[PDB]
Every structure is written in structure tokens, then in C-alpha cells.
Amino acid sequence: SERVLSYAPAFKSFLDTSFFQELSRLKLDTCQPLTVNLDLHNIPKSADQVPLFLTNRSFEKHNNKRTNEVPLQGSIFNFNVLDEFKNLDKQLFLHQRALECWEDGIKDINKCVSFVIISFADLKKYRFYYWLGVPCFQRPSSTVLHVRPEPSLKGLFSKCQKWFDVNYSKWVCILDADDEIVNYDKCIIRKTKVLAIRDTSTMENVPSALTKNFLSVLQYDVPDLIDFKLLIIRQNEGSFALNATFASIDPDMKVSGWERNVQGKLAPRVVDLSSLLDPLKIADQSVDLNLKLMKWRILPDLNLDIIKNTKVLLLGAGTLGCYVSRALIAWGVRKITFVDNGTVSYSNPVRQALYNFEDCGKPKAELAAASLKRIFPLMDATGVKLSIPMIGHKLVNEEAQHKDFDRLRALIKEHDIIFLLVDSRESRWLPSLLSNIENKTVINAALGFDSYLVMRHGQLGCYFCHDVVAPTDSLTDRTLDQMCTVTRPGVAMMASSLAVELMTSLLQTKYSGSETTVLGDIPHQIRGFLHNFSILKLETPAYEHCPACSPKVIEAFTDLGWEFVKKALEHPLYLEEISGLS
Amino acid sequence: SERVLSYAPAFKSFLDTSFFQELSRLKLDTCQPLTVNLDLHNIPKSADQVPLFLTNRSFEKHNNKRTNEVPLQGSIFNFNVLDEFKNLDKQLFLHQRALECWEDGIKDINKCVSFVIISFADLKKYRFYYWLGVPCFQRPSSTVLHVRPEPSLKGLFSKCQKWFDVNYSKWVCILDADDEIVNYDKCIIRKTKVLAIRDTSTMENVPSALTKNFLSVLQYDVPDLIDFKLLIIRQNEGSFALNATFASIDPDMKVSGWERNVQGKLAPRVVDLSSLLDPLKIADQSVDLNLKLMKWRILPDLNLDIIKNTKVLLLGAGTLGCYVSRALIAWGVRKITFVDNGTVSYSNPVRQALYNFEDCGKPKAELAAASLKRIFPLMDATGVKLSIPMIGHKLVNEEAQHKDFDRLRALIKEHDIIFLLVDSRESRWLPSLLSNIENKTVINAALGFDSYLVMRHGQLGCYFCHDVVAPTDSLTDRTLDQMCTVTRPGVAMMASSLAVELMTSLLQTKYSGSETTVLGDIPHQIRGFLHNFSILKLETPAYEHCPACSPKVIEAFTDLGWEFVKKALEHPLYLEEISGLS
Ligand SMILES: [Zn+2]
Ligand SMILES: [Zn+2]
Ligand SMILES: [Zn+2]
Ligand SMILES: [Zn+2]
């Protein structure tokens, strides 16, 4: 029948985002007073103790309890040094608190109840470290308590329940000589012998650990009282009466009270609210949803990941490079690398869509990358100042130009799709080969005053298989990929987007027995004309004597290497001997 | 035979851009010492005096004359207050100088020669105010000089010429008792009676005014010497000998020396070097040349001014508004006005081409304008936060929404071409009408997941004449202008550029007997599709019962006005009664 009284944690903590926000606002503008409003009626069957709710309001003075709520005073100790937090005497700290509670408990037994929070806020990473502590002292530590049940007294319990509901500041009450509930009074309990406590535990037959606190005070006030009646009053059905007696197993005061973290261990609790409060992450979120939402409502069969995870390499941060990098981004592409040897000129900003008047004179390639990051910070934008040697062009400073060759491979390599966005035919050679020899997909964008050309090579022909423009062609036609960068503006815009939309269609699985995907066709070549507003799709087979993808040529580069390039670059006729046009 | 000696200005000033630059560098980091190197041999037949060349080097100590050059010490007085400059005693200042020269002249006759510059630099406007002053004193003022020619003595002249060439620091020489050229010596000239001066004037028979300076010293050194021989030595053929005699027409010292400005008046000289040094103007220059150069080499028959001088009004600073304003700029368009009621959202920057992560939350319309100005500072970019009410949409707050209506007219009015770049059909009505009622050209851009539509109205039909998409159409087709802003990115890019290239072709004079200009066609409607990479041009006649351009409708708006709109907006069926679809 008998037993020793065991307890349960007084409270469970619930810190709302608003709490942590307020916490931060204050760190950017010691000890801090808090105040909660306990609701000992609204307790989920699922929990074991009164839930402690902390929000940005707990910090304030003017809180506003509702009928039947019990206001509870508390505090928070914030630390700037994460080490200080970690290296604190968790034990000593709770003990220093328990001493303050004990000091007030001997003045008003109803004031030995309080909570405390230790914390460290990592405002940059939005990580928050905190530990809730409820001062629970037992003095003397030797004194335990033997108890025996007593058949319920719903009459007495209810009586006490109403009393505590009304007296929202009291945690203990007793009976006077007329058997009526009255405030705790040492000399009166000494005789009446019945102590009633407002339990914050639901644990069946196990009172809150705050019980130890009051008992410590009781003992101090009535050394002799060794036998009595304990009533654990709960604002529900669990209220139970007990036949107490004070024992003593061999002034020593033990203190407990730290809250077990999520995992169940006795250590701090950490919460990462970056996904919620980090604008930069909330930003990254939306960019994502735009596509997921787009897919979901109009094209569930769209593969977004592939596009997102493609590492694009843009050769040229000029007019085309900008509009292209612009369209890629908007598709989700997160890895983009710019390769341009020049710098931003006065006449660039209005045409090349990633520059401002202020960045004139500065290195172009590395600035475009910087510009994507302003638009979208998470972007993996990189700029490399390297030079692509042209065919039929006296090698200048062979050493350094050689490095530019090796360095250009390292790049055509670490990437998935290569965008060839240069001015002239002569500057497409070296890179197209390197990209073929590296088994990479190449998309080409060429500009003409009126027209443009977009195409791919992953067998289909490459740019250099067959000529594009004939001699007997139009004047405004022959300006195609002819070092003609300044054209009717709109040309680069279309050429760009089509070049990107082709890369995204081509990146989707093709329907067996057909040349299409969920996004439409996957043409080989696209040709546009502004004076008539038209587009044409043409396909062309690999040519046997092409100076770029011909077996003999690839062979040559494979066998000799740079010696071949160097020679080819300075002497174009040479390539024609190798290919077989001769 | 006789006459009175007249003079000519000692020097002519030439301030090189480098001078003014150095001048500035110093103002951003009193009196300043200058030093020039006169070249009295290299004198253009066209000039009247030795040219004084000032550059950024004049400021320096280590200048480096060339053989036969005469170093001349000078100074500059700079002013920060333009008023101080203006309100200075030009007369007193030159006189205070002449006094210093006179002080050194009596110590070494060869040191009474110097120049001075007063200036005010307007570094922001690149305007420079300066006045060159050459201290020329005549003392006493009463003493003039009667002179009579003397048959050349090329022997004597040459003798003196060599002497001055060698003695680059001397301005005067004389003959000793052995009839040999020697440095000036008061007691020696008192007897030898021949004074030779290094003339800096080419003026036939008129010596430099610096002559007065030496004569002033001569008089002071030899009060008695009343008759003598003056030799005006020029480093060429004009050297002439004179029979002098000192007169006196009734110590008073008059001072002259200020340089006549470009116009010939005796005031400061002002030079505006903004077109040269203003990066912002040099910038504006290039943007200009790009097109002039483009026209010149590929299309001399292109009218650029028209495009440049068009005041474009963009309704919507979303995805379309950005790419469009982007293409316009690059064509030269300098007046662009953005009209958008919303603000920049997290998911915007990657799609809407004129925004950065940093400007999220801020008012969209006014920010796009700000963004064009960063790209190109001279742009006349304006942003207006106004709202375009939708058809079939419960009027909300009639008053303010009314203003938004009146204010939208003021704009569709002060502009030349109107770009309709909104999300839905419902938001194109009010503006399309207003733009028709205002006789303005309207270009429309509609977005669909896969497609887009661009068209114009200046009789051809308007957007609302005939339906665009049918019900029995494709799923990915019916998303056209269906509040579908998030589509395959490239759509807005093409839709935009084509919309701008159409406006530029349509802005060029049409070849009589044909529907084309120097830039190509001028379609009514352009339709594009991404899944197949195609474009179509369709034309459609004005419809009799169109709810926007139908005679009955225009009539209605004309007759009633806002009362009509308000009613039409809230009740679409109404419009159909008016038009006649009923
Ligand atoms: Zn008492
Ligand atoms: Zn080939
Ligand atoms: Zn002497
Ligand atoms: Zn119509």
C-alpha cells in the first residue's frame, strides 16, 4: 500500500518563432524578465505536464491572462559567446536559481515557483540554442516522503479546484479550523495538517516536481510536522489525496529541473529557423515553386531536376552571353560559368544585358558572374578571364596562350553543356573541337544584322561541317557570324532564348520512335529572319572532310595535341590538308 | 619719317586639355608656379605673337626645353568661388603683378618678364574660366618714345640673334666699347647707346608690349639717356633697327596685359570640356555611334531619329516590360515610362530582367525606371504606381480608382507608342480603348506556356475584335494571355523583342504600293510556338461588334465617359449590348 513519492517534470516548453524573433530584435538593440500564462485546464491527454508557451509576448510587461490562467514569472540569460553557453556550470546555475526561489519561498511559499532559460543566438545562421530550467529544490536531501493513497474526496478536490481557479497567484492552500480553504499559514497547518498543491503534472499518480519546493518550505516552517495530508489538485479528474509522512534516509539541498531535449537527453535544444526567416532561403524557395507550380498545372511530365543540375559553360559574356545566362537562370540552372577575356565598355550596358554604366572599364567575365549573384544570390556564378585563339592568326606569346588552351579544356570538361557565343567563325573552332573531343553538348549562337543561327552537336553535323552562308547570298544575310555584334537588337534576344529553349527540350527524354520530347521538337539547326519574321529548321549530316569533326582531324588532335592546334591556328590551309578538302 | 612706338600683345595663349586636367587633379588634392618653354623660331605666318603653350607639364618643376627655347616663369591663381573670380579687380591685380616685375627688373632687367593666369574651375560641369595676363608696365606713363627707321643691318641683327639663341635667360643685350654683344649694363649702355630686345611679336614694325617693361627699367637706370638705338630682334626676317628718343607728354606707371578672348573682347575665356572628359557624355556618345555605324555600313536608309525620339509607355513592369524596355533602350529610345501597380517579389528577379534580390519588397514600377538609369544614366526613365481596373470586377473605392482612370489618360496621351504588357485579357480593355480614343499606336504582348502573340492597332482589327484562342484548342494553347505569367522563360524573351522589332519596322516609311519598309514587313499579328519553333503572321479586319473599337463603343465612351467605363467594368454584358453581340 505504501510507497515513496516520485515526481514528473513541472513543465514542457514550447518556444514559438515569435519568441526567437523578439529574442533577436533585442540582441541587435545580461538577464531578461519573462512572464507566461499557464492554462492548467487546456491540457492534451497526450502530454504529461502543463505546456509552457513562450512567444514574443513573454518578454513584455503587459501580458493579459484569461480567466483561470496562472501567471508565472521567469527569465532568460542570453550569451553572445557560444563557448560561454556550452562552458557554463549547468548544475551550479540551476542551483544559484533554486537558492533565490528558496529565499522567497520562506517569505511566501507561493513564490518559490519560477522558470529560467539560457540561450545563445546565432543570428546569421538563424540557429538558436536554448535550455529551459525549472528550479526544483529538495531540502534536506536526506528527507524523502512515504505516502499511502486515500479514497477520493471529489467534494474536497472540487473545493480546492475552485479556490485555485480564483486565486491565480497561489500554489498552495490549506484548511482552517472551520474546514474551509484558506491561504497557507505555518501555524495553522501545524494543526489542521492538510496541504493542497496546484499540480502542473498529468502523470497518473505522480505530482509535479515543484512539489519538492513546497515540501522544502513546509519542513522549514514546521520542523515537527512529520505526518499530514497531501492533496495533489489537478484541473481535471486526476486529483488525488495522499497520506503523507516525512522520512529521512541518512541542511543539504539537491536541485533538479533541466528539460530533456527532443532526443530525450539532458542537453540544450537547438532550432534552425533559416528556412523560415532567411529571406535568401525564402527567396530560393519561390524561384523553385514557380517551376514546380508551372510543371504541376501545365506539364507534369516535365523533368526539372535535369535542367537545374546542368553545369552550363558560357563562352562569351557579351550580348548573347547575358541574355542566355538570363534565360538559363529563370529555368533553374544554378551552375553557370562565364568565359570572356575583355572588359565592359561604355557602349555595352545598353546592349549586353548584365552591365551598368558604373561597371565600365572593369573585367567583363568576372562581372557578369557578380551580376547573376545580385539577381539570385545562391547562383553558382563564376567568371574566368581567358582568351580563345582564332584560326588564321599569328600565334602571339605561345607560352601564355598555351595555358589559355589547357585552361579552356579544364573548363569545357568540368561542365555539362557548352554554349558557344563568340563573334566570328574563326573563334568557334578550337572550342568546338575541344568540346567534341570531350564528349560535351555544344549549342551555337551566331548573329547577323537581320538573322541568327542556333544549333547543336552531341551523328549530326557541327558548325564547321558545311558552310552556313553562301557567297551568292544577300548583303544583310552574309553578315551572319561575321564579327557583327551590333545588329538589330532583337536578334540577340531571340537567338538567345531559342538557344536556351532548345537546350531544355534536348535535355528531356525523347519519345522512342520520334524526334521530340515533352517540350516539343529538338531541331538540329534553327534559322531566323527579322525582315520577314520567320524561322526555319534545317538538319545537316556530318561531313567527311570537315575541318573540325572529321575523323582525320580528331585523329590529329588526339595523336599530336597542342603542336597540332598551334600549327592549325597559324596555318588554316594545313587543316584542309588534314581534313582532305585539298 | 618719324612716329610714336605702338605695340602688340606679347603672347597668345594655348591651354591644352592636359593643362585643365592637371588643374583639376590639384583642386581635388592659393597661387601656383607655372613654367613654359617659348619657341621663338616656330612661329606661324598666321599669328602675331609667340604662342604660349600650357599643359599639365607647365605645373611641374622638371620641364625640359629644347635648344633655342626660352624658359618663362609664370603663375596661376585659382578660385573656388565663381563670384570671387568675377568680382576681382582685374586692373588692380595686373597692377600688383607689374609691381613685382618692376621690383625684379631694377635688380635684373632680364627678370621683368612673366605671365599670370586667373581661373575658376567648375569640375562638375567641366567648365573652365581663365584669363591670361602679361604684366606690361610703362613708367612714367607720360614718357612716350619717338622713333625713326634705320636701314637694316643684317650683320648686327644676326649677331644679336645668335646671342639670344645661346643666352636663353636674357631678354636684352647691348654693345660694349669693342662693339661686341654683352649682357645689359647700365653704365655701359649709358655710353654705347644701343639696346637690343628679344621681341616676341611678329606684327610688322610693331614690337611686343613687353618692350615697355625694359624701357621702364632703362629710364630708371639712365635718367639722362634721352636718345639711343633700339633693335627689335626677331628670330626670323622681321628684325628691325630704330632711331629712338625719349619724349614726355605732360612716377606714374600704367599697366596693360590682359588677353582678348575668342570674341575679341577683354574678358575671361571659358572652355567646356564635358564632351571630352565627361564619362557620362563619352558614354552617351558610343551608344549613339553603335547605331550610326550600324546604319552606315549595313542600312543607310534606316531612320534612326524617329525611333530615338519616340516616347514609349510601358504598361506593366513585369517580365515583358523588362525585356521590352531592354530592347528599346538598345535601339536608342530615350523616353520610357513604366506603369505598374505592384512591388518586386522574391520570385521576380530571375524572371523579370530589371530587378535584383536586394530590391525585393520595393515598389516595382518606380524601380524599373531606376534600373534603366543605372544601365544608361541619360535615359528619361519614369515610374508611375497606378492601377488598371479589370473588366468584370466589382468597382472598389470608386473615387481613387477614377483618378487612376484620369491619370492613365494623361499618360496614354503624353506618349507616342503604347505597349500593352499585362497578364490577362480583362486588363487590356480600358487601356486599348483609351489608346484608340487618343489616336495612339498600341502593340500587344500576350504570354502562353508555349506560345505568344504580338500585334498592333493604329483599319485593322484590335485585340478585342475577334477571339484569339478557341475553346476547342490545345491545353498548352489556351493558356495564352490567361493570367499565365510563369511560362517557359524564353517565351517572354521572343515576344518582347519581336514586339520591339515590329515597332521599329512600323516606325519606318512604307514603300508606296506594298506593306514593307527598309527594315522588312510590318505584320498585323505575329504568333509563335516553342514546341515546334515556328512563327505565323495573321491579319484580321476590324469587327463591327467588337467591344472595344466598334463605332457604337467609341461613341458611348465619347458621349458618357467614365460613367460608361465604370458601368462597363462592373458589367461586361453591358458592353455586349452596346456593341451589338446580343
Ligand atoms: Zn502564522
Ligand atoms: Zn563537322
Ligand atoms: Zn654697371
Ligand atoms: Zn476591335
Swiss-Prot record, chains A, B:
Keyword S-adenosyl-L-methionine carried by entry: no
A single GO cellular-component term on record: extrinsic component of phagophore assembly site membrane
Full protein name: Ubiquitin-like modifier-activating enzyme ATG7
GO MF terms held by the record: Atg12 activating enzyme activity; Atg8 activating enzyme activity; identical protein binding
Localization in the cell: Cytoplasm; Preautophagosomal structure
Organism: Saccharomyces cerevisiae (strain ATCC 204508 / S288c) (Baker's yeast)
Protein keywords: Autophagy, Cytoplasm, Protein transport, Transport, Ubl conjugation pathway
SUPFAM superfamilies: Activating enzymes of the ubiquitin-like proteins
CDD domains (UniProt xref): Apg7
